Coordinates of C-alpha atoms and ligand atoms in Angstrom, one line a residue:
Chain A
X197 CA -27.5 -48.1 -39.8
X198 CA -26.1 -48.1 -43.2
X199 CA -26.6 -44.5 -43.9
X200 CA -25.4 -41.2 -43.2
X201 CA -25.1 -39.9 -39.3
X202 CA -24.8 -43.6 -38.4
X203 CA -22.4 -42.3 -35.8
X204 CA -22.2 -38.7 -34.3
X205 CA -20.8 -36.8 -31.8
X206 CA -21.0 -33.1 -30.7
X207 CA -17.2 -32.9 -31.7
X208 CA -14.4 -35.5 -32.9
X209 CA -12.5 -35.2 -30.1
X210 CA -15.5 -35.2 -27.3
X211 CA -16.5 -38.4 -25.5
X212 CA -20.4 -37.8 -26.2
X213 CA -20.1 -40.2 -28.7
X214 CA -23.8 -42.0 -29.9
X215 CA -24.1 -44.6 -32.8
X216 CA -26.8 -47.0 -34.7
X217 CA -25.1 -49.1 -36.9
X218 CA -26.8 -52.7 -36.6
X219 CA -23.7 -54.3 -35.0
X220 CA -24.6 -57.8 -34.0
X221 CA -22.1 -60.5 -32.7
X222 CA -22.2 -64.3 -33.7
X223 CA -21.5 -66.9 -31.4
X224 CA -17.6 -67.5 -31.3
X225 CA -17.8 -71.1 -33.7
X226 CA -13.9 -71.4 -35.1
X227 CA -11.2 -73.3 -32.6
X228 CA -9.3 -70.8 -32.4
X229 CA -10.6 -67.2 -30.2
X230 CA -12.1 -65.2 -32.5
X231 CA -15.5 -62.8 -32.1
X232 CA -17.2 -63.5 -35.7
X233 CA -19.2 -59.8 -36.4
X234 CA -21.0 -57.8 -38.5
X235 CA -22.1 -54.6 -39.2
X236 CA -23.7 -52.0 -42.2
X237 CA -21.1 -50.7 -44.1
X238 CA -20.0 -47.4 -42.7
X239 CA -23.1 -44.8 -43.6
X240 CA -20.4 -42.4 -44.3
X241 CA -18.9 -44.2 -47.1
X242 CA -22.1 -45.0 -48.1
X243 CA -22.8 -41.7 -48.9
X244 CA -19.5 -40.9 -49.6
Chain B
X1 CA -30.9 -87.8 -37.5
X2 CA -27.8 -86.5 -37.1
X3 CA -26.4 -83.5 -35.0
X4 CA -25.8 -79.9 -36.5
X5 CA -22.6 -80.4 -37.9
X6 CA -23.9 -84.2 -39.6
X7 CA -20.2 -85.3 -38.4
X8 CA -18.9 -87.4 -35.4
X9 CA -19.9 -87.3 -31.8
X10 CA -17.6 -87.3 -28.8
X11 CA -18.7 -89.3 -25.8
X12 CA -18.0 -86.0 -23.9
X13 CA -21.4 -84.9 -25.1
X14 CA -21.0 -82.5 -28.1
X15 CA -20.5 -82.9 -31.8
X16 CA -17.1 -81.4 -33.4
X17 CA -16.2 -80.2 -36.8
X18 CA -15.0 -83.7 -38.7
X19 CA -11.5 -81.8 -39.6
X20 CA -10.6 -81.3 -36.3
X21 CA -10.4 -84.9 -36.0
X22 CA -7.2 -85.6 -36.7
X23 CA -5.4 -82.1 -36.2
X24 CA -3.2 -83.5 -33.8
X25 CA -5.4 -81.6 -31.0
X26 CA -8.5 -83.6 -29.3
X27 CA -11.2 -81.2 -28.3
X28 CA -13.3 -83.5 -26.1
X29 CA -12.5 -85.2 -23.1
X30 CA -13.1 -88.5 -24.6
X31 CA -11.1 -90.4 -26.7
X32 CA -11.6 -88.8 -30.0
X33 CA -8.9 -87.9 -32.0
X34 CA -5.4 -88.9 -31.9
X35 CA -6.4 -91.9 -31.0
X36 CA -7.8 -92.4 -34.4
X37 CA -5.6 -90.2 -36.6
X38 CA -2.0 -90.6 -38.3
X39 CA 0.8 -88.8 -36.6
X40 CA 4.7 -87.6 -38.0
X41 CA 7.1 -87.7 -35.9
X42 CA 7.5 -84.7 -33.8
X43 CA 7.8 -80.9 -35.0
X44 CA 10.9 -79.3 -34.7
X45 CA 9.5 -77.4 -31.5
X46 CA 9.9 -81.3 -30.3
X47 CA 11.7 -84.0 -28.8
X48 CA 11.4 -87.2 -30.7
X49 CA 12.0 -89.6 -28.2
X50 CA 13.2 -93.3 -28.2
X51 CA 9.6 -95.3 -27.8
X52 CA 8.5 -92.6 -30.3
X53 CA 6.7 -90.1 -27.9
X54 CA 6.8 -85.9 -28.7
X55 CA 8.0 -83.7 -25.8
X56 CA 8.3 -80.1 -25.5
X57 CA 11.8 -79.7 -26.4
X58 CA 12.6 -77.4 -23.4
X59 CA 12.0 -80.2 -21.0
X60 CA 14.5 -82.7 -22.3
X61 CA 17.7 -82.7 -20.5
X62 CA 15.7 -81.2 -17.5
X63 CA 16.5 -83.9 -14.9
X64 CA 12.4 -85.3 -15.5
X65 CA 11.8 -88.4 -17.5
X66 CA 9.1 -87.1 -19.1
X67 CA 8.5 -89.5 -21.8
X68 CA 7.4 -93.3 -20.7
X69 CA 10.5 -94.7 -21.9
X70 CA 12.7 -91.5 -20.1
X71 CA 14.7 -90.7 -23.9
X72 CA 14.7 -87.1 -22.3
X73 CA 17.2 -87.7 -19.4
X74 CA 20.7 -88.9 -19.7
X75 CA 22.9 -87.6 -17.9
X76 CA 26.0 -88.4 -20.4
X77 CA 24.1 -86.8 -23.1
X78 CA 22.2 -83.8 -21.2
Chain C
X50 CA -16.3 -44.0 -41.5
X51 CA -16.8 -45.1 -37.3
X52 CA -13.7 -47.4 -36.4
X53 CA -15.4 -50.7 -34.8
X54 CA -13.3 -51.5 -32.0
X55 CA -13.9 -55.3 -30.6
X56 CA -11.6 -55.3 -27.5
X57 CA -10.2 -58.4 -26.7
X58 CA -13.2 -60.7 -25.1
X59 CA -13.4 -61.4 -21.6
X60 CA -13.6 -65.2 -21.1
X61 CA -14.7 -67.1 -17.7
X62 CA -13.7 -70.4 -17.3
X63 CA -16.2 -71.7 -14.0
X64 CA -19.1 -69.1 -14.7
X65 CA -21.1 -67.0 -16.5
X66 CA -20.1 -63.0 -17.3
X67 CA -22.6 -59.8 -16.8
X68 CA -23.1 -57.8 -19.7
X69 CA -22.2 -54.5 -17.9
X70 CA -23.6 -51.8 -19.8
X71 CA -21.5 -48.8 -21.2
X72 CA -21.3 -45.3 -22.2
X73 CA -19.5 -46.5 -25.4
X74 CA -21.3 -45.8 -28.8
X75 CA -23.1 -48.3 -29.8
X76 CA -22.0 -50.4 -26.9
X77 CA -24.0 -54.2 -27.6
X78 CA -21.7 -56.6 -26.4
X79 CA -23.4 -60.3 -26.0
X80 CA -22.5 -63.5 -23.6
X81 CA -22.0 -66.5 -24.7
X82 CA -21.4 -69.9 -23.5
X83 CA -19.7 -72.9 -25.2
X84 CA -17.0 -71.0 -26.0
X85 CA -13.9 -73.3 -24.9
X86 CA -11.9 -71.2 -27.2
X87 CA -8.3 -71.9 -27.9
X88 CA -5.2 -69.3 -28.2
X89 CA -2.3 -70.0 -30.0
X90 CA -0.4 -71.9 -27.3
X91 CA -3.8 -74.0 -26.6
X92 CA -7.0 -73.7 -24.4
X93 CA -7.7 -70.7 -22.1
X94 CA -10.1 -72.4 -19.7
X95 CA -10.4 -75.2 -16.8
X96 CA -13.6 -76.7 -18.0
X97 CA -16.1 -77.7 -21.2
X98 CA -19.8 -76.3 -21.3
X99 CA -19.2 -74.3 -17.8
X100 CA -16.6 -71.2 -19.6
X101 CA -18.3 -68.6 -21.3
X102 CA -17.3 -65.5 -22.8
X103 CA -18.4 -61.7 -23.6
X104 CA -17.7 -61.1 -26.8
X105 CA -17.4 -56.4 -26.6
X106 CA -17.6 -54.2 -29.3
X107 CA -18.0 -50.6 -30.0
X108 CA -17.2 -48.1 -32.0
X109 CA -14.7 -44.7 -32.3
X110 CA -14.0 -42.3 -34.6
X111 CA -11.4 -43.6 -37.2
X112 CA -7.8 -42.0 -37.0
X113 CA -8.1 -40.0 -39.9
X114 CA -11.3 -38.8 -39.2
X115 CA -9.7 -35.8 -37.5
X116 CA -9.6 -34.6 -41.5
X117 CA -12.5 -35.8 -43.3
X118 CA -15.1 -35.6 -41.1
X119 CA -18.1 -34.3 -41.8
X120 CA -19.6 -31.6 -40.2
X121 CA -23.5 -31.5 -40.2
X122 CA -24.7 -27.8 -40.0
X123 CA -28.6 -26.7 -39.4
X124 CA -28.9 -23.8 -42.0
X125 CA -31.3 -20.5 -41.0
X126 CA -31.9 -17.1 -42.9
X127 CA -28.4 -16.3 -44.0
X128 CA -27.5 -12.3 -43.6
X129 CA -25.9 -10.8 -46.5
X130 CA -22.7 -8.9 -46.4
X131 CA -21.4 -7.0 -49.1
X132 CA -18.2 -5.3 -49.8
X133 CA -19.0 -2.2 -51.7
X134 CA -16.4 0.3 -53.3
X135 CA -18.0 3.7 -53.6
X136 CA -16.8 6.5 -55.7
X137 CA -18.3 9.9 -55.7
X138 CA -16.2 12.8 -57.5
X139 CA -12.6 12.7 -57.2
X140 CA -13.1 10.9 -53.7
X141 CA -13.7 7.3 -53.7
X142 CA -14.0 5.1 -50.4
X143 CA -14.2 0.9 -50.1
X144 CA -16.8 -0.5 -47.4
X145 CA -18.2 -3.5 -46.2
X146 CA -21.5 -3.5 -44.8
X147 CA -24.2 -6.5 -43.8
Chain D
X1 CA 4.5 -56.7 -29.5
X2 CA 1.5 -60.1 -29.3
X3 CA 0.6 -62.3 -32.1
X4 CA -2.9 -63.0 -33.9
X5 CA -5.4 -65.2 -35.6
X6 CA -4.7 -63.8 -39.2
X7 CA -7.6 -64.9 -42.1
X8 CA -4.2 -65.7 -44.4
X9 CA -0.8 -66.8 -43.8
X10 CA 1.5 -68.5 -46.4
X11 CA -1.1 -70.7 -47.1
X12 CA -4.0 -69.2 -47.8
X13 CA -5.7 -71.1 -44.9
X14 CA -6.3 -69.2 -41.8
X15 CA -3.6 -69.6 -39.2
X16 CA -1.9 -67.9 -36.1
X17 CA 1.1 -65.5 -37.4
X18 CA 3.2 -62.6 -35.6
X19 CA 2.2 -59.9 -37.9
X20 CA -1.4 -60.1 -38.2
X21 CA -3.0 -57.2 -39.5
X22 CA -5.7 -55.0 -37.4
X23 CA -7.0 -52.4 -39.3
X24 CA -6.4 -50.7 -42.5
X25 CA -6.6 -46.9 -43.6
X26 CA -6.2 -45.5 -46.8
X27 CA -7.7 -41.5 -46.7
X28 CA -4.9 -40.3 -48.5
X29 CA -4.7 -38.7 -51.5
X30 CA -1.7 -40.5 -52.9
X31 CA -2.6 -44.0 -52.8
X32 CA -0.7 -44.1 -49.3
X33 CA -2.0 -46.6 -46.6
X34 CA -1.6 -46.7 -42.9
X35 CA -1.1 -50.3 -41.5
X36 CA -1.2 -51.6 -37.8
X37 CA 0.6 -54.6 -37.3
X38 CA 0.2 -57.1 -34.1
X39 CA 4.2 -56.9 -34.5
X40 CA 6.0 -53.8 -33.1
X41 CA 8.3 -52.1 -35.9
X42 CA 11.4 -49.8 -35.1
X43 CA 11.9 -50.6 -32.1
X44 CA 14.4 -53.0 -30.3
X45 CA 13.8 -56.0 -27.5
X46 CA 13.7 -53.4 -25.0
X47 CA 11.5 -51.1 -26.6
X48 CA 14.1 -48.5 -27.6
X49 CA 13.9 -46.6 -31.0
X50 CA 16.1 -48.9 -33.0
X51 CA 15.0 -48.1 -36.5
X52 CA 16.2 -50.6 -38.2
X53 CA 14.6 -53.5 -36.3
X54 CA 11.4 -54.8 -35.5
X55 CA 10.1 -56.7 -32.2
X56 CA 7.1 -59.6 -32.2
X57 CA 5.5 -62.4 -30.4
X58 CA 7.7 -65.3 -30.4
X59 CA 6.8 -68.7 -32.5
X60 CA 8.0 -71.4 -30.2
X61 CA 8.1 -73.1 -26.7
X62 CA 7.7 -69.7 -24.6
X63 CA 6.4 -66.4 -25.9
X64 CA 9.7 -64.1 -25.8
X65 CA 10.7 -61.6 -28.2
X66 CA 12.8 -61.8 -31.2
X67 CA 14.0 -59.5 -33.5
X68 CA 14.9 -59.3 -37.2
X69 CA 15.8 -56.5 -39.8
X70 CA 13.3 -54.5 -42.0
X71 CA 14.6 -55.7 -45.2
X72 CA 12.7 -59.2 -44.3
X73 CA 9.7 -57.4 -43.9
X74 CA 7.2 -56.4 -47.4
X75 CA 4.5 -54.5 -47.4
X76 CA 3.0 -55.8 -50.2
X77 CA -0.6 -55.4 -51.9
X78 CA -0.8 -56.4 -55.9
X79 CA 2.7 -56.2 -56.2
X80 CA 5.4 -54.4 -54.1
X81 CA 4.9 -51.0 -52.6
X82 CA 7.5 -48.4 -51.5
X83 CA 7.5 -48.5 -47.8
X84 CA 7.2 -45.1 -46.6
X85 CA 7.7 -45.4 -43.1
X86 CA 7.3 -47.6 -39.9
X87 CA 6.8 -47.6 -36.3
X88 CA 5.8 -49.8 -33.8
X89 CA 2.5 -51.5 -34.6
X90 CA 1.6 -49.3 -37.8
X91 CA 3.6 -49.6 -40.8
X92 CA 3.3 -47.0 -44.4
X93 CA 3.3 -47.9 -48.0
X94 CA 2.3 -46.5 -51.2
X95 CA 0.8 -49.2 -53.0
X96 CA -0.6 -50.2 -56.5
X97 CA -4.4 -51.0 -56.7
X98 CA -5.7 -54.3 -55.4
X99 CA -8.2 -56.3 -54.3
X100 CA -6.3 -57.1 -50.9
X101 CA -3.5 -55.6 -48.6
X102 CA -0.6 -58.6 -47.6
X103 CA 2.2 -58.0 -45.3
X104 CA 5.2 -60.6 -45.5
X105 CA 8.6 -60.9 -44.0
X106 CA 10.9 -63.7 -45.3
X107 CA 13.2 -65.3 -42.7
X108 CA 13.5 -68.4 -44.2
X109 CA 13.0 -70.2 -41.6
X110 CA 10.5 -67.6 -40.2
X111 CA 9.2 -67.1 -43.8
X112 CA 5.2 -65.4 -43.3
X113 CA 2.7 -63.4 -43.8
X114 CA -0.5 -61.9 -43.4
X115 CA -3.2 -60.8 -45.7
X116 CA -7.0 -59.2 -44.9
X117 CA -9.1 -58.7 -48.0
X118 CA -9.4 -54.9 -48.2
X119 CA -10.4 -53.4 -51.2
X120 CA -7.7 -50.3 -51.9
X121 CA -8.1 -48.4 -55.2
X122 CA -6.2 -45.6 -57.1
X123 CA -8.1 -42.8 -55.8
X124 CA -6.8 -39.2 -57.3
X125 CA -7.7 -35.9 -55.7
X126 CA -9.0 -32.9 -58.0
X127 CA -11.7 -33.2 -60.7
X128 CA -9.6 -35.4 -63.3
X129 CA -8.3 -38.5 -63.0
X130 CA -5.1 -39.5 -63.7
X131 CA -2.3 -42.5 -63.3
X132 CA 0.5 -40.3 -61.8
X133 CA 0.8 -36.8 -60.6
X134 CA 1.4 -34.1 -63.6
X135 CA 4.7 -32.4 -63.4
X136 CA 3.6 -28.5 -64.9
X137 CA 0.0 -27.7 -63.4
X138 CA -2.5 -26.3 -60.6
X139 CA -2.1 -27.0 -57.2
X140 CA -4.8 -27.7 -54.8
X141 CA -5.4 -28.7 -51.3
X142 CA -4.9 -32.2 -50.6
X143 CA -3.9 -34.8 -47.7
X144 CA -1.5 -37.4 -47.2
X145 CA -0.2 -39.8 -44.3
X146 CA 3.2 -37.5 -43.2
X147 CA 6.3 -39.7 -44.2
X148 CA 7.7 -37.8 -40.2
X149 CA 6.7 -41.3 -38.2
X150 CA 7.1 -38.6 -34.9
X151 CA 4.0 -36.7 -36.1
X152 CA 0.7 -37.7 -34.1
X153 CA -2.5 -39.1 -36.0
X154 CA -4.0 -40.0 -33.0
X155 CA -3.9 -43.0 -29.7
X156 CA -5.1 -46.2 -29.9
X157 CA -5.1 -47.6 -25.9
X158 CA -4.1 -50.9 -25.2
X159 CA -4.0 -53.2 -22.2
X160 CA -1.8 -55.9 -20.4
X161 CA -1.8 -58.9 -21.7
X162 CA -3.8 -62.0 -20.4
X163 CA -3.5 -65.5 -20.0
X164 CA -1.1 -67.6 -22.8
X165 CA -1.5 -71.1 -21.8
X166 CA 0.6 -73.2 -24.1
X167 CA -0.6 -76.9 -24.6
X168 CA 3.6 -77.4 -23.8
X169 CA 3.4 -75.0 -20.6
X170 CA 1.3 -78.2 -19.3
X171 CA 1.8 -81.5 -19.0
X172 CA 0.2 -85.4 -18.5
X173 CA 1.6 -88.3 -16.4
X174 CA 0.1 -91.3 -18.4
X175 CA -3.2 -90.7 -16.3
X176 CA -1.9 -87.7 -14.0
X177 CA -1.5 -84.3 -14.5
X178 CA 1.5 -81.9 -14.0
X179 CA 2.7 -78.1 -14.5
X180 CA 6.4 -78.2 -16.1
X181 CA 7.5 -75.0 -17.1
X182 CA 11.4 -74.0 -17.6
X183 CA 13.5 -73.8 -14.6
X184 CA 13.2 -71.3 -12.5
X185 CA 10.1 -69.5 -14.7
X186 CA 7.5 -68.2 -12.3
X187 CA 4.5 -70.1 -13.4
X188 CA 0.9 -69.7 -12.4
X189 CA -1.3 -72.5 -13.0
X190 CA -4.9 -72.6 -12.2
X191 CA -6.8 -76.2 -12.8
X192 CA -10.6 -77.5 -11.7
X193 CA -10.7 -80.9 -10.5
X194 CA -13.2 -81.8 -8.5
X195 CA -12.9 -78.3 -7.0
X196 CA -11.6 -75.2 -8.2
X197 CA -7.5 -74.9 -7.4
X198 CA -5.1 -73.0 -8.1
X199 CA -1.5 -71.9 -7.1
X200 CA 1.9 -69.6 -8.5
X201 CA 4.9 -72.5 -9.1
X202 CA 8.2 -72.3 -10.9
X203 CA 9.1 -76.6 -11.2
X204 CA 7.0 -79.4 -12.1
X205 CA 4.4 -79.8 -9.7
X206 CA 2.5 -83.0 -9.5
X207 CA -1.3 -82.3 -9.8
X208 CA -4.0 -83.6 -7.3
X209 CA -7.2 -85.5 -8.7
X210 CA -6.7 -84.2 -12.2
X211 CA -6.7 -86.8 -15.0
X212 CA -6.6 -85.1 -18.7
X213 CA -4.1 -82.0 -19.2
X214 CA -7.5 -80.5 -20.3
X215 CA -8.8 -79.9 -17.2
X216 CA -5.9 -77.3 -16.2
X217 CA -4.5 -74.0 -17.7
X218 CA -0.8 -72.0 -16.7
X219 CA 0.5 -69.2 -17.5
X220 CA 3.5 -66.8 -16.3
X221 CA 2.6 -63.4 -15.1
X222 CA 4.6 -61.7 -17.8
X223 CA 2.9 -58.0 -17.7
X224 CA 6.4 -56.0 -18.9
X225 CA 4.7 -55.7 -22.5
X226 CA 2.0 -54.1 -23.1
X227 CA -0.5 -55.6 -25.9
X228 CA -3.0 -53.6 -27.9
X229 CA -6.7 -54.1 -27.6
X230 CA -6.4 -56.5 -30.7
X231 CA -9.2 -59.7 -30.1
X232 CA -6.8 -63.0 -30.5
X233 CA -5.6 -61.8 -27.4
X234 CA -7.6 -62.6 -24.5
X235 CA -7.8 -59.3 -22.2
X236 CA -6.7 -60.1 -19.0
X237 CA -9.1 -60.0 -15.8
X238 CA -8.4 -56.4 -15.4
X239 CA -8.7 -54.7 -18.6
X240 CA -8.1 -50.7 -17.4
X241 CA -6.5 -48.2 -19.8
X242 CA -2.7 -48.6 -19.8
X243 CA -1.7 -45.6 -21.2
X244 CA -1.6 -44.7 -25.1
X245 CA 0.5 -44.9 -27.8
X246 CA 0.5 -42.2 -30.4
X247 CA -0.7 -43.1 -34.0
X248 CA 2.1 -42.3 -36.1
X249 CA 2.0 -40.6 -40.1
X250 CA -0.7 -37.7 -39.7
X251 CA -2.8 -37.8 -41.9
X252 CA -1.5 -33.8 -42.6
X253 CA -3.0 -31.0 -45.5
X254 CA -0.8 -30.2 -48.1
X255 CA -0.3 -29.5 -51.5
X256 CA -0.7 -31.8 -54.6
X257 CA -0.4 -31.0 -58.2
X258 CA -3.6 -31.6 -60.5
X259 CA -3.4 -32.0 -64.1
X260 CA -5.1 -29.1 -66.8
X261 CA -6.7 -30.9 -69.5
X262 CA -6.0 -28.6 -72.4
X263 CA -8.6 -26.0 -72.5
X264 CA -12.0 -26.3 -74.1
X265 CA -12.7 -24.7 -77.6
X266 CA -15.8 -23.1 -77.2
X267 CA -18.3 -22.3 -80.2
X268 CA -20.7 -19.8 -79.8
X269 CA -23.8 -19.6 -81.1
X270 CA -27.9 -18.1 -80.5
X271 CA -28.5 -18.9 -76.5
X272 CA -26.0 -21.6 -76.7
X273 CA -22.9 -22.3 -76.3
X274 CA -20.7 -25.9 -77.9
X275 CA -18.0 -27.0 -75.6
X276 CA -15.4 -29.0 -77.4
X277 CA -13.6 -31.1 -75.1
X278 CA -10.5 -33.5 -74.9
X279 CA -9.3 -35.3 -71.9
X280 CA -7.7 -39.0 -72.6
X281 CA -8.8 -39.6 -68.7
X282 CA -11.9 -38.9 -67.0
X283 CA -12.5 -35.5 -66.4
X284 CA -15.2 -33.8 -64.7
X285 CA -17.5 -31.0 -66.6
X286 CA -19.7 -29.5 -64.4
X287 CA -22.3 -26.6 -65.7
X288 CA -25.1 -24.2 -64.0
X289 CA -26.9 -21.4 -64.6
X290 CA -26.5 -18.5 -62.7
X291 CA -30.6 -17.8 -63.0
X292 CA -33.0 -17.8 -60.2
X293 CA -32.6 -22.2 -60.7
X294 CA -29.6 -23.4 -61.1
X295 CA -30.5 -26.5 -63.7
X296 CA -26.9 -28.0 -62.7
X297 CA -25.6 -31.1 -64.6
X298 CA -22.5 -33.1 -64.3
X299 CA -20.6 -35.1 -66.7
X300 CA -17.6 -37.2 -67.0
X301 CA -16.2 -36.5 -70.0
X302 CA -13.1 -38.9 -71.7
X303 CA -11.4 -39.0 -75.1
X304 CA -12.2 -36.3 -77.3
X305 CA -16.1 -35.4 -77.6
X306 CA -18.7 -32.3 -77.9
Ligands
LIG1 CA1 -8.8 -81.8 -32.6
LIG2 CA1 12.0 -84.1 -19.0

């Protein structure tokens, strides 16, 4: 997570899609439906 | 002690948010919030009825009374 | 820059929900109960503490990925090539060669 | 075209609005971003290509679709921005620097918006900065979002939407319960008491053992439009692939024109060399030896300097 290759694939288009990237879901608090998330910045823009 | 939030408890066994308590909503199955809360008349979605009650305003003039004191039906107006 | 998609959660309103793994990337989705969430209209479930809901997320390759993506290459012993114009007397000749 | 829970609406407060933002993209080279909307744009109640209209999740007693004009609708970040195209949920704009990215239409009556807190700068392409494009100079390979809404960036899928159970689409009986929808509406309504129950209706129906309009849930079976994958909507209890739509303005290579600070005065002297330089906006100077190392530096130059 939070650095480069935090998600990769043999190609863009292919399916074989693999990925680290620390995402982690709260428990839903506000009235209203809502799925309160995070995650590391994107490792790509990171090293971008 | 008090529960996580520190705010009010509903009989219905859990604690809500203090704000919610007057939101025009009641999220427990007790008692809770209208019933303790300051209410406008109806929204403009509504039906302000004669004894003061809020309908949905696609059910008056739908042959129901829905409201106790039945505002919502009359024939000479619907 | 990975798009996290977070479909739309799957809510139960008399029981609890598997997390059924996936193939996604990153798939990590998480159960939860409690949830009694509400929609814009109002509440989506029949009960209190017996909904719950699976809260799904994954992630996808950004739209404009497709441009600036970039490609991670494994680098071994590079061959040259060269290019070479040769000239010998009044005949000359150009020629690439590795 | 469904509605969502968007972080801002015309008070900054959180609230439900039809034209809550999804996501945000802003790869281009021009400053140009792609928006998806919850609403649909450019097309008509029936989901043909009406340009000059825009479809979205109703506001009031039953979720049906309305429509309304473009000129109510403002992409808007900072200040204004030039739309530069729209089609159903994605919107275009070139806009000014900001902190945040806010959509708004202005009805009046349906007078809203939606903002998300997205940090979009003035990004320039080349190796020297500058506030607009220079008119005489080199051009280099760049990319921008395609004003041509029929080009293809890609799909996003999307599935039928779930239950909507208005707190109206239900009702009480000072102690009962009962399912009043409009006439003639094909409700279903689904309601634990005691026991799970549930049954499809289309009048009132008085309820059995149920006490508090809590206890029960309705909602019509109103599959004719499609809804994206979006969270505020809740997926239904089959959430298979409905098809695709294509993601419109691709992000396409092209050419953009770079500006040509005017060229450095070099001084020469023993093994060394004086660059005099003048740029009134950052401008890259980049140096290496062509030896067996490369001792490569970098510098962003401004003003006038040595
Ligand atoms: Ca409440
Ligand atoms: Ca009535």
């Amino acid at each position: 997570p939070g650095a480069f290759g935090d998600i990769q694939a043999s190609s863009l288009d292919a399916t074989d899609i693999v990925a680290r990237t620390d995402i982690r879901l709260l428990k839903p608090s506000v009235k209203n439906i809502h799925v309160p998330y995070t995650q590391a910045v994107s490792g790509y823009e990171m090293w971008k | 002690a008090k529960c996580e939030p520190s705010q009010f408890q509903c009989t219905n066994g859990r604690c809500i948010t203090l704000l919610w308590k007057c939101d025009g909503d009641e999220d427990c199955v007790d008692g809770s919030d209208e019933k303790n809360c300051v209410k406008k008349t109806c929204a403009e979605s509504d039906f302000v009825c004669n004894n003061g009650q809020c309908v949905p305003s696609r059910w008056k003039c739908d042959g129901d009374p829905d409201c106790e004191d039945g505002s919502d039906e009359s024939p000479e107006q619907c | 820059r990975f798009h996290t998609v977070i479909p739309s959660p799957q809510v139960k309103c008399c029981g609890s929900l598997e997390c059924k793994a996936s193939s996604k990337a990153d798939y990590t989705c998480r159960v939860f109960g409690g949830v009694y969430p509400f929609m814009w209209g109002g509440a989506q479930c029949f009960c209190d503490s017996e909904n719950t809901q699976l809260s799904e997320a994954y992630v996808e390759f950004a739209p404009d990925c497709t441009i600036d993506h970039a490609v991670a290459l494994k680098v071994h012993t590079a061959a040259l090539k060269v290019g070479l114009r040769i000239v010998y007397g009044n005949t000359t000749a150009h020629l690439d060669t590795f | 075209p469904y509605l969502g829970f968007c972080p801002y609406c015309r008070h900054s407060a959180p609230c439900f609005s039809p034209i809550k933002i999804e996501n945000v993209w802003d790869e281009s080279d021009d400053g140009s971003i792609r928006i998806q909307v919850s609403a649909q744009f450019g097309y008509n109640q029936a989901g043909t290509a009406d340009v000059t209209k825009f479809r979205y999740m109703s506001y009031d007693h039953d979720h049906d679709i309305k429509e309304d004009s473009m000129e109510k609708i403002a992409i808007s970040t900072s200040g204004p921005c030039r739309r530069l195209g729209h089609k159903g949920y994605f919107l275009l704009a070139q806009c000014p620097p900001g902190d945040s990215v806010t959509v708004s239409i202005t009805s009046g009556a349906s007078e809203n918006s939606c903002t998300v807190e997205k940090k979009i700068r003035r990004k320039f392409v080349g190796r020297e900065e500058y506030l607009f494009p220079p008119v005489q100079g080199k051009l280099v390979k760049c990319h921008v979002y395609d004003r041509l809404k029929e080009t293809s960036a890609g799909y996003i899928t999307m599935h039928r939407p779930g239950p909507h159970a208005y707190k109206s689409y239900l009702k009480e009986a000072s102690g009962e319960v009962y399912i009043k929808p409009p006439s003639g509406k094909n409700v279903t309504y689904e309601c634990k008491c005691g026991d799970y129950s549930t049954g499809i209706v289309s009048t009132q129906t008085k309820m059995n053992g149920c006490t508090k309009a809590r206890q029960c849930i309705a909602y019509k079976l109103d599959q004719t439009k499609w809804v994206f994958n979006s969270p505020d909507l809740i997926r239904h209890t089959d959430h298979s692939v409905q098809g695709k739509l294509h993601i419109p303005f691709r992000l396409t290579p092209t050419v953009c024109p770079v500006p040509l600070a005017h060229t450095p005065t070099v001084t020469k002297w023993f093994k060394g060399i004086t660059l005099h330089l003048t740029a009134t906006r950052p401008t890259l100077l980049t140096t290496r030896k062509l030896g067996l190392r490369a001792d490569a530096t970098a510098e962003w130059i401004t003003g006038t300097t040595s």
